[PDB]
Design a protein around this ligand. Structure first.
Ligand SMILES: [Zn+2]
Ligand SMILES: [Zn+2]
Ligand SMILES: [Zn+2]
Ligand SMILES: [Zn+2]
Lengths: 98, 98, 98, 95
């Protein structure tokens, strides 16, 4: 779906902004532990967060969550008030009628 | 200085926003390894970045850097142009003539 | 108890072997998130492991667990079978009859 | 052979930690250094630095300790660092 694609792609761009290899590192982790990709952020935000926490810890996971939200606010601009990835996905679904 | 105070407080608030124990954890790390506090971010940004990287790795350090820059822009001017903590400190010093 | 003492001492020395600040860093994390100390490893190994995983991620938590098990092995019995901290504590309790 | 034994031993250690650690570390090493796990033998100092960049110094030190322990287990003897470990392997196979 459109919302799913924008979230996934925007997260990937954020990972690339952090460092060249973060996409590869996180994807290696997601594939090996959940047989999933970055799309998990949209499909199951809670599980995605838990997976990131298992990779670098909760502090790092929270930092990533904060960055992702800030980046989506920068792309979608309009009224994003989410404080969590779960809230962010909920808002995206409302914006795109999903 | 005004700039040192503003940068340090902004970082401290960011850590508290991340999670309840991040301030204590990072401060324990800086105290034990460099006998310094969070003010090190202003006094020697490169050393501060290096220290955070030693605590959680470079991916996590980068995420914190991005979050700090974003929060300072919201504190001072929506668009300081700094893309690194070093540039951020340089810009703050230019703004306050420090 | 003797078992609690031996396990706690083993962990503390392992932390100091890793790096000068690890004891302080892990203790800051345990204090802030669980109002507990390193003794939690004996009192509730599952919770201790979960806490370390929240600090540095599961891969790092596993490495620490592996080190703790290896150290206790070469201290008590070079024959114990523990593969997890919970199993290690269970074995210590049986060995000391606690 | 020394460079092959250290590499194979490291990989086995990574697998004992968790299923995806090998994949995770290799993804990191080749995005950042276009290198593999053999960097541990070719340049142990750099390898440790690379691992430190992935999870931090505390985690990298823990991995070093586990690697030294494992290699000692399948090889035998004196080594408390990765640099010394590689220096010892060289002496055993004249490298
Ligand atoms: Zn990808
Ligand atoms: Zn001042
Ligand atoms: Zn006692
Ligand atoms: Zn040791």
């Amino acid at each position: 779906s459109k919302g799913r694609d924008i979230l996934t792609k925007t997260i990937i761009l954020a990972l690339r902004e952090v460092a060249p290899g973060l996409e590869a590192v996180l994807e290696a982790h997601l594939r090996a532990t959940l047989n999933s990709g970055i799309e998990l952020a949209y499909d199951d935000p809670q599980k995605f967060k838990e997976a990131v926490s298992k990779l670098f810890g909760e502090y790092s996971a929270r930092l990533l969550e904060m960055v992702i939200i800030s980046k989506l606010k920068g792309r979608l601009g309009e009224d994003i008030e989410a404080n969590s990835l779960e809230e962010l996905v909920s808002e995206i679904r409302k914006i795109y009628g999903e």
